[PDB]
């Protein structure tokens, strides 16, 4: 009945959204760390190839490794630029819009939870509208509903309650007086009229919206109405705008999975940086033919397909460095070394050796 406390079918879908929004900061931290990690892996491969070239310098194998080193250093460069230009804003915006909306929802739900007079009369009722619910740890009436922002650990969340189309559980409600409102539980947050609702001497001067514009509390003796939020469209200045902002920011997320962060399986000529380097440093002519690039490449890779690129990478990975450059009993093959700073100083050692050979 109108002007009565809210049954579980009303507030459980809000709990579900709040719990899922709680994971958006975790996903943002995961993605920012994953981007940095992938950049670091690209840089390690660039450094191994560079070290191999110095060790084997002046050979066709070394020139192949220079091409490989250039490729992976450009991947690392481009991932850092994308982290600056795109990923940082995407992940901060998702974190902020999700956390802001969660705060709007949780403040409303916490008010419902506390506004009660007895075990059978209050604003937050169970599924049958018989008993007011209580919070026990991170649950309310048996529903996960912490009403707090959890400690932020990296995690990959699975979009369930907020997806590509909108908030799946926040559907059009045709019969709120019977499906949202209890039969007898009293709740002055259920209307703006003075007899049973928020008005004191008279009715409130207008309808009131709560939960960032989701629910509309009329100032007459009538049931609430809700915005359907499951088939959203991009808009500006809506009463429920924070729902749209979080949905839009979440839909834009790519993770650390755009092309800068992934390896390329194309033929060698099409791999990042390869054609420009062949043209500028080997052919020494701009606007070259494809046949010429492929012909140059066979000199150094014995072919021009991904298989010949992998073969050079295996030679790079198997190359040992000088024993004294690693700790006692530690591995010396480049493929068994990782960490940018560790490989950077090994490259510097071999560049000094290269200088001493020219001396």
Ligand X SMILES: *[C@@H]1O[C@H](CO)[C@@H](O[C@@H]2O[C@H](CO)[C@@H](O[C@@H]3O[C@H](CO)[C@@H](O)[C@H](O[C@H]4O[C@H](CO)[C@@H](O)[C@H](O)[C@@H]4O)[C@@H]3O)[C@H](O)[C@H]2NC(C)=O)[C@H](O)[C@H]1NC(C)=O
By beta-carbon proximity to ligand X, the closer residue of 195 and 263 is 263
**Residues 161 and 17 sit within 8 Å (Cβ to Cβ):** yes
As a whole number of angstroms, the distance between CA 255 and CA 30 comes to 9
As a whole number of angstroms, the distance between CA 307 and CA 265 comes to 9
* Options 153-161, 164-172, 265-273, 311-319: segment touching ligand X (CB under 6 A): 311-319
Q: Six-digit token pair at 292?
A: 């010429």
- 66 near ligand X, rule: CB under 6 A: no
**Residues 217 and 190 sit within 8 Å (Cβ to Cβ):** yes
By beta-carbon proximity to ligand X, the closer residue of 26 and 48 is 48
- 76 near ligand X, rule: CB under 6 A: no
Contacting residues for 2 by C-beta, under 8 A, at least 6 apart: 177, 181, 190, 191, 221, 222, 223
Which DSSP symbol is given to 319?
P
By beta-carbon proximity to ligand X, the closer residue of 156 and 172 is 156
Q: Six-digit token pair at 73?
A: 């250093």
From 316, 321, 346, 347, residue interacting with ligand X (rule: CB under 6 A): 316
By beta-carbon proximity to ligand X, the closer residue of 230 and 264 is 264
* Options 45-53, 103-111, 187-195, 233-241: segment touching ligand X (CB under 6 A): 45-53
From 42, 67, 113, 147, residue interacting with ligand X (rule: CB under 6 A): 42
- Binders of ligand X among residues 262 to 281 (CB under 6 A) are 263
- 345 near ligand X, rule: CB under 6 A: no
From 307, 338, 351, 352, residue interacting with ligand X (rule: CB under 6 A): 338
By beta-carbon proximity to ligand X, the closer residue of 124 and 316 is 316
Least distance (Å) between residue 263 CB and ligand X: 4
Q: Six-digit token pair at 81?
A: 């630029």
Which phi and psi (to 5°) does residue 308 adopt? -70, -30
User: 108-147: b or e for each residue (b if 16 or more CB lie within 10 Å)?
Assistant: bbbebbebbeeebbbbbbbeebebbbebeeeebbebebbb
- 255 near ligand X, rule: CB under 6 A: no
- 336 near ligand X, rule: CB under 6 A: yes
By beta-carbon proximity to ligand X, the closer residue of 229 and 334 is 334
Q: Which residues bind ligand X (CB under 6 A)?
A: 38, 41-42, 45, 48-49, 263, 313, 316-317, 335-336, 338
């Amino acid at each position: 009945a109108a002007e009565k406390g809210f049954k579980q079918a009303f507030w459980q879908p809000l709990c579900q959204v709040s719990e899922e929004l709680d994971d958006q900061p975790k996903g943002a931290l995961f993605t920012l760390q994953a981007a940095a990690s992938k950049i670091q892996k690209m840089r390690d491969a660039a450094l191994r190839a560079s070290i191999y070239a110095e060790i084997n310098h002046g050979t066709n194998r070394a020139k192949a490794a220079v091409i490989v080193a250039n490729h992976y250093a450009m991947k690392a460069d481009s991932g850092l630029e994308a982290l600056k230009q795109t990923l940082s804003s995407q992940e901060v915006t998702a974190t902020a819009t999700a956390s802001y909306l969660k705060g709007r929802i949780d403040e409303y739900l916490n008010l419902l939870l506390q506004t009660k007079e007895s075990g059978t009369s209050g604003c937050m009722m169970d599924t049958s509208g018989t008993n007011t619910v209580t919070k026990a740890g991170g649950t309310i009436g048996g529903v996960p509903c912490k009403l707090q922002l959890s400690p932020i650990q990296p995690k990959r969340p699975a979009a369930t309650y907020l997806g590509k189309a909108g908030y799946v559980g926040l559907t059009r409600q045709a019969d709120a007086a019977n499906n949202f409102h209890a039969a007898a539980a009293e709740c002055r947050l259920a209307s703006g009229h003075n007899t049973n609702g928020l008005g004191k001497s008279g009715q409130l001067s207008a309808a009131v919206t709560m939960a960032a514009g989701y629910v509309t509390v009329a100032n007459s003796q009538t049931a609430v109405t809700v915005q359907a939020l499951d088939a959203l469209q991009e808009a500006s200045g809506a009463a429920h705008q924070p729902w749209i902002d979080a949905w839009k920011a979440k839909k834009a997320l790519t993770g650390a999975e755009t092309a800068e962060f992934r390896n390329e399986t194309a033929g060698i000529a099409g791999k990042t940086g390869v054609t420009k380097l062949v043209e500028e440093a080997l052919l020494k002519k701009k606007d070259s033919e494809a046949s010429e690039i492929q012909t140059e490449l066979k000199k150094y890779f014995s072919g021009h397909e991904n298989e010949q690129w992998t073969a050079i990478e295996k030679l790079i990975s198997e190359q040992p460095v000088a024993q004294n450059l690693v700790g006692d009993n530690q591995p010396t093959k480049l493929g068994e070394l990782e960490g940018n700073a560790k490989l950077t100083t090994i490259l510097a050692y071999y560049r000094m050796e290269t200088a001493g050979k020219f001396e």
